[PDB]
Structure 1
Amino acid sequence: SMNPPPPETSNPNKPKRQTNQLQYLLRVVLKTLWKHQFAWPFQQPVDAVKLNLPDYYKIIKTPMDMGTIKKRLENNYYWNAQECIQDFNTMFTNCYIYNKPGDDIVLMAEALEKLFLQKINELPTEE
């Protein structure tokens, strides 16, 4: 069985910024979801070998996880908040696409997404 390489977390030629909105996405949004009791399945790329999901990367073509998002925020990979918000939404959408309604992993994603939406609602205005 085979995993793909992880999503990109380093690209020197990609333009980057350090902004109050991206600081908020690390200090509030990522840290709030990361410490949650249901974070663990989302803290690293899906290991389709370990988890015996041989069709995962046949169905999910834009994989994303909070481990990757944490690295992107900590290594100042993003230009804007919308890029980072898209990564979170990709992660949740992948979970709902691959899994069945009422699956434990879907209930876990839904709990994290509720907190995500609460925090994004209070995204501060750009300085």
Structure 2
Amino acid sequence: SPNPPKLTKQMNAIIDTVINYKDSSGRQLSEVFIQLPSRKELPEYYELIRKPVDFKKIKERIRNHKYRSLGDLEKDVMLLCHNAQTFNLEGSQIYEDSIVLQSVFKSARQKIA
């Protein structure tokens, strides 16, 4: 069941780069994405988004060896960004932040040796 330690380390390094990214204003773009909005505060989110996911869930899936490859990890990060771009409108802060994070993920995955 457990993944080779190198694979887990690679998955965690990529996700940490995304989470730790700060823009030129010093803002942690990932912050709102760490946890989904609650069902009591935003049931509309769960009514529209079929497969909700946040970075807390992605980190759990790395830790519990749910992803078996970097392609499996990328699918969930792309799902997170797709969901942000589905519920929220183009030009909104969260939609625009998710575009930047998608780019950070892609660059971080590409730099794995």
Bin of the TM-score, shorter chain as denominator length: 0.7 to 0.9
Identity, in percent, stands at 21
TM-score under structure 1 length normalisation: 0.73
1:100 aligned residue: 89
1:49 aligned residue: 40
> How many Å apart are 1:38 and its aligned residue?
1.1
Q: State the Cα deviation string for residues 16-67 of structure 1 (Å, max 9, x = none).
A: 422534421202x1111122311111112232423xx332111111111111
Give the structure, 1 or 2, with the largest relative contact order (CA under 8 Å, sep 6 or more).
1
Q: Which runs of 5 or more residues in structure 1 are unaligned?
A: 1-14
CA RMSD of aligned residues (A): 1.8
Q: Which runs of 5 or more residues in structure 2 are unaligned?
A: 22-27
Matching of residues 1-127 of structure 1 within 5 Å: 15-18=1-4, 20-27=6-13, 29-36=14-21, 37-50=28-41, 53-124=42-113
Equivalent residues of 1:16, 1:78 under 8 A apart: no
TM-score under structure 2 length normalisation: 0.81
Give the letter for the 2:104 counterpart. Answer: L
Where is the helix percentage greater, Structure 1 or Structure 2?
A: 2
Partner Cα distance (1:43, 1:33) in 2: 11
